[PDB]
């Protein structure tokens, strides 16, 4: 996994690759690692996939209820505080490593959070097995006072570094842009630089190739009338 977060002029952007692995084997070639906590608060997760999802759905559920209780739009610091206290309580056994970003009435925010419950603040962050390849790009090209278009470019370039140079990362690039005073735009498959080439041959079989013993109709319908 390679995930990044980058701040800019009037907001924040996050990005991720789309490969999920099972050891050396690729389980899903187009995984969605960008999760929604609230409409304008999104997080990207690395580590144990089930944990990053489950912890995100849970905090997002409680954030929604909190937003309804208080008649206010959810803040990123609330999602952060709720996540770290949950993760800290489980002493790292919930292997969720997240980059949390979003906009709220306070402004734009970008945080990282580790499985044991520690949090960090930054203008640019990277997590996952490709974090070093991505951070090399961020440290080379990041500057103060970035534009929206410059930040999206920097973020996707950082993800590409992970895609090409890290074996745990691959396939496509997802992006989510959270700008102040605007709806967040989720850009699924923003880049698609790893399309499989045409195969040399078709392996469609002649009908009747496979040997069969028995056939039977399966009753999926309910018990019938009359």
């Amino acid at each position: 996994t390679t995930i990044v977060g980058v701040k800019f002029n009037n907001g924040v952007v996050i990005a991720a690759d789309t490969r999920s692995t099972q050891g050396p084997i690729v389980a899903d070639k187009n995984c969605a690692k960008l999760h929604r906590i609230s409409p304008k608060i999104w997080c990207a997760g690395a580590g144990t996939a089930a944990d990053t999802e489950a912890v995100t759905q849970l905090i997002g559920s409680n954030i929604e209820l909190h937003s309804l209780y208080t008649s206010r739009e959810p803040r990123v610091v609330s999602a952060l505080q709720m996540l770290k206290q949950h993760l800290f309580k489980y002493q790292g056994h919930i292997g969720a490593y997240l980059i949390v970003a979003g906009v709220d009435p306070t402004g734009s925010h970008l945080f990282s959070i580790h499985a044991h419950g520690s949090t960090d603040v930054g203008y640019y962050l990277s997590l996952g097995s490709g974090s070093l390849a991505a951070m090399a790009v961020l440290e080379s090209h990041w500057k103060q006072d970035l534009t929206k278009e410059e930040a999206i470019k920097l973020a996707s370039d950082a993800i590409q570094a992970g895609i090409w140079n890290d074996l745990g990362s691959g396939s496509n690039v997802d992006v989510c842009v959270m700008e102040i005073g605007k709806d967040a735009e989720y850009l699924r498959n923003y880049l698609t630089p790893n399309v499989r080439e045409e195969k040399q041959k078709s392996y469609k079989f002649p009908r009747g190739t496979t040997a069969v013993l028995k056939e039977s109709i399966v009753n999926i319908c309910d018990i019938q009338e009359e």
Binding site: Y203, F205, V218
Partner: protein, 204 residues
């Protein structure tokens, strides 16, 4: 010792044009020993199909559990559960045992009765969903199945063609795995008809 490979077994699911297919081997073993050649790993709750690999006691237990939950769902909702919804229920149920998990590799297959859209999904033992367009694999020959499916599969196959593709993916994967085989079953699923075929394969 490894719970996920004591009993052995495999499950594979594929999408086609307005159809889905799900198949499994029939072996149940105690490591090297073959015990049963009639241990079907595919169950259905209305029109939603669930294949489960891994530890056989957990396979049996989960089937009984999802039968329990889907029967109550239907009584309260006054309708059969759909694949997308059932997939979330499976994920929820597995993660609730996060630190004492069922040692299984479930696979969902079915067609949404309203949209008519074919649907397949896979999970790890802890609930992480793998929603694939093409195919899902699970079991002791998952590596073998990934290689067969990735090379044999092509999108928008017709039911009778999809049958041949999935059957050959299963059979040739099973024949390169000591812990899989001893028979096989393939379900071909359309919006309002489902055919079940037992395959002839080597019994060693």
């Amino acid at each position: 010792s490894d719970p996920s490979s004591i009993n052995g077994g495999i499950v594979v699911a594929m999408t086609g044009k307005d159809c889905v297919a799900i198949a499994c081997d029939l072996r149940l073993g105690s490591q090297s020993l073959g015990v049963s050649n009639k241990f079907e790993k595919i169950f259905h709750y209305g029109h939603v199909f669930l294949g489960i690999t891994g530890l056989a006691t957990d396979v049996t237990t989960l089937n009984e559990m999802f039968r329990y939950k889907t029967n109550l769902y239907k009584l309260k909702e006054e309708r059969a559960i759909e694949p997308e919804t059932f997939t979330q229920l499976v994920s929820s149920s597995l993660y609730e045992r996060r630190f004492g998990p069922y040692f299984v590799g479930p696979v969902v297959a079915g067609i949404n009765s309203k949209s008519g859209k074919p649907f397949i999904a896979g999970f790890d033992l802890i609930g992480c969903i793998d929603e694939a367009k093409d195919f899902i694999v699970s079991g002791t020959a998952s590596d073998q199945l990934f290689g067969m499916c990735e090379s044999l599969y092509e999108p928008n196959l017709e039911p009778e063609d999809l049958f041949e593709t999935i059957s050959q993916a299963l059979l040739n994967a099973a024949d390169r795995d000591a812990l899989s085989g001893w028979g096989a079953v393939v379900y071909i699923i359309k919006k309002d008809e489902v055919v079940k075929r037992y395959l002839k394969m080597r019994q060693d």
